[PDB]
Amino acid sequence: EQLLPDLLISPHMLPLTDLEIKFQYRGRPPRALTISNPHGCRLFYSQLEATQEQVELFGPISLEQVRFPSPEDIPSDKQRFYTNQLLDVLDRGLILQLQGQDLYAIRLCQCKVFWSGPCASAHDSCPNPIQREVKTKLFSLEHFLNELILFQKGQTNTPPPFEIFFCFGEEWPDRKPREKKLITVQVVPVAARLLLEMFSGELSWSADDIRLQISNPDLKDRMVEQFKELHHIWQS
Amino acid sequence: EQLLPDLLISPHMLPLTDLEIKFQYRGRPPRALTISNPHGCRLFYSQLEATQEQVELFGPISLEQVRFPSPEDIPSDKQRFYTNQLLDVLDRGLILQLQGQDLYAIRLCQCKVFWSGPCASAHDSCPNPIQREVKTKLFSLEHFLNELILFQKGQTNTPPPFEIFFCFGEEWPDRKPREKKLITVQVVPVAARLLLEMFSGELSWSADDIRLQISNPDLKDRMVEQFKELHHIWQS
């Protein structure tokens, strides 16, 4: 299994820079896109553009510039009011940048950002805010693949996590349900999902863990089987 | 709130017969469709067709006839071998039928069928097989809406469940992860999802439960705000 990372973590094997980004406003259908910019992206809401002279404010111009969706079609005025208050403090944005195969956040926005994800701390139960201007590791593909290997061998029953969950402007994790959060964003490293699928679809020749569950045939089953036999005969 | 069911449970308000049906083979992308046949549907795999003279075997001809996807593109021969053994005993199928706004299963297939869902029993932890030829209630929209009402009022923190999960040919629920199940199907009553969205997007005028989380502005925030002010000025 030691050859696997070198074999698989490669542009000819995986889309190493692809992130799927799903925006969700409370009570609306989600809106998703995929970016493959190798510098990463910046999620933000602004009338102003990132420029070279203002990188301190808005980050590097090479990031994929991904705007939060208009809240216009939020039917509740009260909800759209709160939502606009948050979007008003999202001008500087949340940078998501790949460093090798690790994904990092850099929060620039005045809006607070809270998150859940593969590298998030698991020592308490309270909210998990992202500190402004502090490079925060969200996900490691190296570690993901190590864990994937143990899962596939059946050494763990838990599939390794890859999805990163952000809540903008309200605390998370929380007692309260995600359905009631005004603004959330889910981010998937597509290479990780692909790798989980790939490994899930590889079984052992030796360790046959599979016990099919099939009733004994009743007379109805028997009639069906005979009809299948006759149909096979008739073909030809 | 007593007027709500009469108001909402109506064809002019909701798609009362729409089910989304998602097929998933281990390690493959899922494959989904939506049916809106008011009789319901039959999930099956067969070279034979439902006919009038064989309703005992294959169910009523009015059901939407939904075939499991070919397992051809499953890359593991061993996996596709087990998968074909299950598909070979799925000729008679699993009927999903609406009775008013309740959804019921009738298993005809020789393959065993196990499930998780809104009406599933919660007294033990073991597998939950569907009994062949026994009308099995999966979901109640009436009850869903009652629960939705309590959620929206904040009387419960848990959103009411609507998704029904079937595993064909292997035990469920189980120690083992769903990612390793050969054949699963997820079924959503679309009216229920719509209703959850609708209710989630209705807030109170009085019970304002929302505390926005926004840092104090630093000098960078202040410069951004001034640039926004200048841009608003410049517009016009």
PDB file of N, CA and C in Angstrom, chain A residues 24-28 79 83 86 114 127 165-185, chain B residues 151 200 209-211 213:
ATOM      1  N   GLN A  24     -25.806  27.521  -0.202  1.00  0.00           N
ATOM      2  CA  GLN A  24     -27.172  27.251   0.254  1.00  0.00           C
ATOM      3  C   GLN A  24     -27.702  28.394   1.130  1.00  0.00           C
ATOM      4  N   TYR A  25     -28.799  29.024   0.701  1.00  0.00           N
ATOM      5  CA  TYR A  25     -29.549  29.991   1.526  1.00  0.00           C
ATOM      6  C   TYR A  25     -30.757  29.259   2.126  1.00  0.00           C
ATOM      7  N   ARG A  26     -31.111  29.598   3.353  1.00  0.00           N
ATOM      8  CA  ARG A  26     -32.175  28.909   4.094  1.00  0.00           C
ATOM      9  C   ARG A  26     -33.414  28.802   3.258  1.00  0.00           C
ATOM     10  N   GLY A  27     -33.901  27.570   3.072  1.00  0.00           N
ATOM     11  CA  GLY A  27     -35.177  27.351   2.384  1.00  0.00           C
ATOM     12  C   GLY A  27     -35.133  27.487   0.874  1.00  0.00           C
ATOM     13  N   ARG A  28     -33.948  27.652   0.295  1.00  0.00           N
ATOM     14  CA  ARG A  28     -33.853  27.735  -1.157  1.00  0.00           C
ATOM     15  C   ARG A  28     -33.170  26.449  -1.647  1.00  0.00           C
ATOM     16  N   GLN A  79     -35.927  37.322   6.203  1.00  0.00           N
ATOM     17  CA  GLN A  79     -34.761  36.519   5.915  1.00  0.00           C
ATOM     18  C   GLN A  79     -33.778  37.238   4.978  1.00  0.00           C
ATOM     19  N   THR A  83     -29.955  38.352   5.476  1.00  0.00           N
ATOM     20  CA  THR A  83     -29.008  37.810   4.519  1.00  0.00           C
ATOM     21  C   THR A  83     -28.158  38.904   3.876  1.00  0.00           C
ATOM     22  N   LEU A  86     -25.418  40.216   6.101  1.00  0.00           N
ATOM     23  CA  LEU A  86     -24.223  39.363   6.047  1.00  0.00           C
ATOM     24  C   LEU A  86     -23.463  39.604   4.742  1.00  0.00           C
ATOM     25  N   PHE A 114     -17.684  30.122  10.303  1.00  0.00           N
ATOM     26  CA  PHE A 114     -17.584  28.939  11.184  1.00  0.00           C
ATOM     27  C   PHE A 114     -17.546  27.687  10.320  1.00  0.00           C
ATOM     28  N   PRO A 127     -18.926  26.302  18.993  1.00  0.00           N
ATOM     29  CA  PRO A 127     -18.674  26.812  17.651  1.00  0.00           C
ATOM     30  C   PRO A 127     -17.198  26.788  17.263  1.00  0.00           C
ATOM     31  N   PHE A 165     -17.723  22.088   5.567  1.00  0.00           N
ATOM     32  CA  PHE A 165     -18.996  22.774   5.698  1.00  0.00           C
ATOM     33  C   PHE A 165     -18.708  24.149   6.360  1.00  0.00           C
ATOM     34  N   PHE A 166     -19.095  25.236   5.693  1.00  0.00           N
ATOM     35  CA  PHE A 166     -18.943  26.593   6.240  1.00  0.00           C
ATOM     36  C   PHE A 166     -20.300  27.158   6.555  1.00  0.00           C
ATOM     37  N   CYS A 167     -20.415  27.854   7.687  1.00  0.00           N
ATOM     38  CA  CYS A 167     -21.605  28.688   7.911  1.00  0.00           C
ATOM     39  C   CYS A 167     -21.143  30.157   8.012  1.00  0.00           C
ATOM     40  N   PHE A 168     -21.715  31.034   7.208  1.00  0.00           N
ATOM     41  CA  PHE A 168     -21.329  32.447   7.247  1.00  0.00           C
ATOM     42  C   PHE A 168     -22.264  33.238   8.142  1.00  0.00           C
ATOM     43  N   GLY A 169     -21.720  33.842   9.198  1.00  0.00           N
ATOM     44  CA  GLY A 169     -22.538  34.810   9.937  1.00  0.00           C
ATOM     45  C   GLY A 169     -23.350  34.246  11.084  1.00  0.00           C
ATOM     46  N   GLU A 170     -23.287  32.932  11.302  1.00  0.00           N
ATOM     47  CA  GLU A 170     -23.974  32.345  12.437  1.00  0.00           C
ATOM     48  C   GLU A 170     -23.141  31.202  12.959  1.00  0.00           C
ATOM     49  N   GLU A 171     -23.312  30.854  14.230  1.00  0.00           N
ATOM     50  CA  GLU A 171     -22.395  29.903  14.878  1.00  0.00           C
ATOM     51  C   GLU A 171     -22.574  28.504  14.335  1.00  0.00           C
ATOM     52  N   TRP A 172     -21.472  27.766  14.270  1.00  0.00           N
ATOM     53  CA  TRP A 172     -21.479  26.380  13.812  1.00  0.00           C
ATOM     54  C   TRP A 172     -20.185  25.731  14.307  1.00  0.00           C
ATOM     55  N   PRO A 173     -20.244  24.461  14.771  1.00  0.00           N
ATOM     56  CA  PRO A 173     -21.420  23.646  15.045  1.00  0.00           C
ATOM     57  C   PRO A 173     -22.259  24.221  16.182  1.00  0.00           C
ATOM     58  N   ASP A 174     -23.471  23.705  16.317  1.00  0.00           N
ATOM     59  CA  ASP A 174     -24.539  24.381  17.026  1.00  0.00           C
ATOM     60  C   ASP A 174     -25.585  23.332  17.440  1.00  0.00           C
ATOM     61  N   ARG A 175     -26.353  23.608  18.488  1.00  0.00           N
ATOM     62  CA  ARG A 175     -27.594  22.863  18.753  1.00  0.00           C
ATOM     63  C   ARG A 175     -28.501  22.869  17.529  1.00  0.00           C
ATOM     64  N   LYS A 176     -28.659  24.042  16.935  1.00  0.00           N
ATOM     65  CA  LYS A 176     -29.690  24.259  15.942  1.00  0.00           C
ATOM     66  C   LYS A 176     -29.355  23.647  14.585  1.00  0.00           C
ATOM     67  N   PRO A 177     -30.396  23.263  13.833  1.00  0.00           N
ATOM     68  CA  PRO A 177     -30.243  22.519  12.591  1.00  0.00           C
ATOM     69  C   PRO A 177     -29.670  23.378  11.454  1.00  0.00           C
ATOM     70  N   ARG A 178     -28.945  22.747  10.537  1.00  0.00           N
ATOM     71  CA  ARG A 178     -28.390  23.436   9.372  1.00  0.00           C
ATOM     72  C   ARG A 178     -29.444  24.019   8.449  1.00  0.00           C
ATOM     73  N   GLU A 179     -30.641  23.424   8.462  1.00  0.00           N
ATOM     74  CA  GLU A 179     -31.738  23.887   7.635  1.00  0.00           C
ATOM     75  C   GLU A 179     -32.137  25.320   8.039  1.00  0.00           C
ATOM     76  N   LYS A 180     -31.765  25.752   9.235  1.00  0.00           N
ATOM     77  CA  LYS A 180     -32.216  27.055   9.695  1.00  0.00           C
ATOM     78  C   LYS A 180     -31.118  28.128   9.597  1.00  0.00           C
ATOM     79  N   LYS A 181     -29.914  27.703   9.222  1.00  0.00           N
ATOM     80  CA  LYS A 181     -28.776  28.599   8.933  1.00  0.00           C
ATOM     81  C   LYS A 181     -29.010  29.421   7.664  1.00  0.00           C
ATOM     82  N   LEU A 182     -28.832  30.732   7.766  1.00  0.00           N
ATOM     83  CA  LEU A 182     -29.077  31.644   6.639  1.00  0.00           C
ATOM     84  C   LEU A 182     -28.188  31.383   5.420  1.00  0.00           C
ATOM     85  N   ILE A 183     -26.904  31.172   5.663  1.00  0.00           N
ATOM     86  CA  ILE A 183     -25.906  31.079   4.592  1.00  0.00           C
ATOM     87  C   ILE A 183     -24.900  29.978   4.889  1.00  0.00           C
ATOM     88  N   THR A 184     -24.938  28.888   4.116  1.00  0.00           N
ATOM     89  CA  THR A 184     -23.924  27.894   4.273  1.00  0.00           C
ATOM     90  C   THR A 184     -23.280  27.587   2.921  1.00  0.00           C
ATOM     91  N   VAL A 185     -22.085  27.036   2.960  1.00  0.00           N
ATOM     92  CA  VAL A 185     -21.372  26.670   1.756  1.00  0.00           C
ATOM     93  C   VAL A 185     -20.765  25.303   2.040  1.00  0.00           C
TER      94      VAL A 185
ATOM     95  N   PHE B 151     -41.202  21.665  14.135  1.00  0.00           N
ATOM     96  CA  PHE B 151     -39.867  22.139  13.743  1.00  0.00           C
ATOM     97  C   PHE B 151     -39.860  23.663  13.487  1.00  0.00           C
ATOM     98  N   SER B 200     -39.074  26.299   5.992  1.00  0.00           N
ATOM     99  CA  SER B 200     -37.773  26.796   6.465  1.00  0.00           C
ATOM    100  C   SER B 200     -37.599  28.274   6.096  1.00  0.00           C
ATOM    101  N   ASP B 209     -34.944  34.802  16.230  1.00  0.00           N
ATOM    102  CA  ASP B 209     -34.049  33.820  16.843  1.00  0.00           C
ATOM    103  C   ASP B 209     -32.620  33.987  16.321  1.00  0.00           C
ATOM    104  N   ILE B 210     -32.375  35.089  15.628  1.00  0.00           N
ATOM    105  CA  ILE B 210     -31.198  35.193  14.786  1.00  0.00           C
ATOM    106  C   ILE B 210     -30.188  36.215  15.315  1.00  0.00           C
ATOM    107  N   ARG B 211     -28.976  35.751  15.578  1.00  0.00           N
ATOM    108  CA  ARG B 211     -27.937  36.609  16.134  1.00  0.00           C
ATOM    109  C   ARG B 211     -26.793  36.613  15.145  1.00  0.00           C
ATOM    110  N   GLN B 213     -23.273  37.048  13.327  1.00  0.00           N
ATOM    111  CA  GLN B 213     -21.907  37.000  13.875  1.00  0.00           C
ATOM    112  C   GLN B 213     -20.943  37.730  12.944  1.00  0.00           C
TER     113      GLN B 213
END
